[PDB]
């Protein structure tokens, strides 16, 4: 079954300025969800976006069946421990540790073009390394999967659930081979985990169960 995301895509006072943000909002169609920016290697769409006062934030949802078992295997056999869990469970954990960010795509316009529907293209997982983007939050509801961002105000919030609970994408499947999601996922841990940590900790953003 289908698991979801969400984070802000960028901080207005912190590219993004409000001006910009309403220039591209809605999309001009859905934005597909992929990792690293790889093309044939989509495994879901943002169900919405809205423009909160302090950034344009997404709900998204992740659906590809093939990833959890790759994720699993990047990770290798000793990871979970005596921890029970379904696929579902093992799937976010996996999510929350190795695909911590997210990185939106813009098109570069030329000088003299005007910002419009068409500008933002699609919403890249970010596969933990040298460079770590705007931190997301994973869950197996939308409604969890947005709790954490306590600043989120109310006004975008509910605007973002009725949007995507209306998203023609919200029951898609995509389809990856295992060749394909493995060269997607292929000290420098550690490292990055501690700043990971802390944008975390920066945003707002802290749990017991995914998060920290």
């Given amino acids: 079954g289908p698991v979801y995301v969400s984070g802000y895509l960028a901080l207005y006072d ?35 976006v ?15 069946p093939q990833l959890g078992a ?11 421990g005596d921890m029970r869990l379904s696929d579902e469970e093992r799937l976010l954990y996996l999510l929350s540790n190795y695909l911590p960010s997210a990185s939106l795509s813009s098109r570069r316009l030329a000088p003299g073009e005007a910002p419009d529907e068409t500008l933002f293209a699609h919403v890249a997982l970010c596969v933990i390394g040298r460079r770590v983007g705007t931190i997301v939050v ?3 509801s939308p409604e969890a999967a947005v ?34 999601l493995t060269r997607a996922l292929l ?20 749990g017991h169960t995914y998060l920290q």
């Fill in 70 to 80: 790759v994720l699993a295997r990047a990770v290798g056999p000793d990871f979970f």
């Fill in 147 to 180: 709790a954490p961002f306590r600043q989120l105000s109310a006004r975008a919030r509910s605007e973002l659930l009725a949007r995507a609970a209306e998203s023609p994408d919200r029951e898609r499947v995509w389809h990856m081979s295992e060749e394909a």
């Fill in 14 to 48: 912190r590219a993004l300025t409000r001006e910009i943000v309403a220039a591209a909002l809605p999309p001009a169609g859905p934005l597909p969800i992929n990792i690293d920016h790889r093309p044939r290697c989509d495994i879901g769409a943002v169900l919405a």
């Fill in 187 to 206: 000290m420098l841990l550690r490292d990055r985990w501690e700043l990971v940590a802390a944008r975390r900790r920066e945003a707002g953003v802290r």
């Fill in 50 to 64: 809205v423009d909160d006062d302090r950034g344009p934030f997404f709900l998204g949802v992740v659906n590809c």
């Fill in 138 to 140: 994973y869950d197996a």
